[PDB]
């Protein structure tokens, strides 16, 4: 049995872990919305080889996964788990977490994204020749953005993307279930405390993460 202090402690731990590991601070991201790539800078990015853009995008992707791994390591529970389990959850979840995190760097006012110090739109990534993939990411980002997720809602929802007992290949499934259940309490409690119950019915379906992430892979 988990008590009110223990649950409130959990909420606060997951929120603090995200803040430490967030990588890009929200205030900085919002401050930088005014800073938008010039036509010559967009052209510059368009002119680059697919290979250069993939190297850059991969660098950013790998960096953001490290910050996910860290976030996990600070969730009180995760280190107690066995390594096979740690690995299964991160392998299956880490990209799906980056995708949710990425929504903070999307601006719905002008359909731009933060990339390498300023904002621009889809056009930046033309060299990749993955218009469709970029379109999904920009739609999905637009759809999460509409909900104005707080830092703590991100923290908590992100933790549940990771700590999922249905992932094939877990050895201590029951330890993962106990952890997920507690994170579900943490999230649902915090939602009640914040008057934010409305979001649940609007969170993207569990497949849409998995589906889209499949496309990336
Ligand atoms: C690690 C995130 N990241 C960042 C960090 C800041 C961020 O999250 N920006 C974005 C926010 C929302 C949508 C975006 C769309 C395209 C590019 C950046 C987007 N910079 N590049 C990437 C790679 C993403 C990759 C995804 C796979 C296709 C190429 C872009």
């Amino acid at each position: 049995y988990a008590s009110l202090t223990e649950i409130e402690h959990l909420v606060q731990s997951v929120c603090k872990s995200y803040r430490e590991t967030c990588q890009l601070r929200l205030e900085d991201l919002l401050r930088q919305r005014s800073n938008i790539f010039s036509r010559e800078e967009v052209t510059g990015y368009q002119r680059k080889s697919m290979w250069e853009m993939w190297e850059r995008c991969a660098h950013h992707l790998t960096e953001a996964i490290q910050y996910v791994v860290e976030f996990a390591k600070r969730l009180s529970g995760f280190m107690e788990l066995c390594q096979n389990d740690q690995i299964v959850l991160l392998k299956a979840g880490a990209m799906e977490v980056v995708l949710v995190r990425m929504c903070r760097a999307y601006n719905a006012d002008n359909r731009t994204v933060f990339f390498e110090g300023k904002y621009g739109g889809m056009e930046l990534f033309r060299a990749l020749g993955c218009s469709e993939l970029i379109s999904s990411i920009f739609d999905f980002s637009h759809s999460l953005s509409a909900l104005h997720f707080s830092e703590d809602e991100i923290a908590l929802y992100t933790a549940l993307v990771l700590i999922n007992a249905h992932r094939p290949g877990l050895q201590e499934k029951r330890k993962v279930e106990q952890l997920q259940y507690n994170l579900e309490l943490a999230f649902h409690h915090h939602l009640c405390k914040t008057h934010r119950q409305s979001i649940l019915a609007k969170l993207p379906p569990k497949g849409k993460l998995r589906s889209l992430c499949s496309q990336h892979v």
Side-chain angles (χ1 to χ4, degrees), residues 2-173 175-214:
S3 77
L4 182 53
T5 319
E6 287 196 341
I7 300 299
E8 287 187 354
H9 172 86
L10 185 58
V11 172
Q12 293 161 22
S13 178
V14 178
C15 302
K16 208 203 57 165
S17 175
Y18 179 63
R19 193 169 187 235
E20 298 173 347
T21 64
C22 64
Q23 186 173 355
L24 301 183
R25 303 193 300 141
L26 181 54
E27 61 191 39
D28 299 333
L29 281 173
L30 302 172
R31 189 184 332 297
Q32 299 300 325
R33 289 167 167 217
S34 61
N35 190 13
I36 294 184
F37 281 119
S38 66
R39 266 181 237 271
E40 287 72 35
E41 289 166 320
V42 179
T43 304
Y45 278 117
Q46 293 175 334
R47 288 240 259 144
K48 298 184 182 284
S49 188
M50 75 195 309
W51 284 97
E52 204 192 313
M53 290 293 291
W54 278 124
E55 284 179 19
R56 285 161 180 271
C57 288
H59 172 80
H60 302 316
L61 244 293
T62 303
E63 257 205 300
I65 289 158
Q66 266 142 33
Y67 276 99
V68 181
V69 175
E70 272 293 315
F71 169 67
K73 298 218 328 280
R74 297 170 197 258
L75 302 182
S76 32
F78 189 79
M79 295 299 259
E80 293 177 350
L81 307 170
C82 79
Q83 324 282 289
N84 168 88
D85 285 3
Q86 288 186 28
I87 293 158
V88 176
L89 294 181
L90 292 167
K91 180 138 187 290
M95 248 305 287
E96 320 182 337
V97 174
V98 167
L99 220 64
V100 178
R101 289 172 163 234
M102 283 163 64
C103 305
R104 298 155 74 262
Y106 181 77
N107 187 3
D109 300 335
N110 63 6
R111 272 125 199 244
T112 61
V113 296
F114 186 71
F115 183 74
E116 303 197 338
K118 307 193 188 188
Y119 278 79
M122 305 204 267
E123 42 174 7
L124 283 163
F125 314 95
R126 205 187 68 197
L128 289 184
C130 299
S131 64
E132 304 252 72
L133 172 63
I134 297 291
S135 295
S136 319
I137 303 336
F138 266 72
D139 290 338
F140 176 77
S141 304
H142 198 90
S143 87
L144 246 74
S145 285
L147 308 179
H148 297 100
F149 274 30
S150 71
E151 297 290 89
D152 298 343
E153 293 160 355
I154 293 278
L156 292 156
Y157 176 75
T158 267
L160 296 157
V161 175
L162 288 186
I163 314 310
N164 183 5
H166 288 342
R167 291 311 185 190
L170 296 166
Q171 294 172 357
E172 308 166 322
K173 205 189 213 234
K175 272 262 231 54
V176 178
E177 290 171 353
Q178 172 81 89
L179 188 44
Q180 167 187 343
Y181 178 76
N182 285 311
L183 286 162
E184 292 163 339
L185 283 167
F187 189 35
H188 295 155
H189 179 77
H190 195 63
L191 290 187
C192 289
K193 294 277 156 296
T194 59
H195 296 239
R196 280 293 272 183
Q197 294 105 316
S198 38
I199 78 174
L200 290 177
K202 306 182 188 160
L203 295 182
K206 225 48 153 173
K208 188 162 190 208
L209 289 173
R210 283 163 129 261
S211 167
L212 192 30
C213 266
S214 291

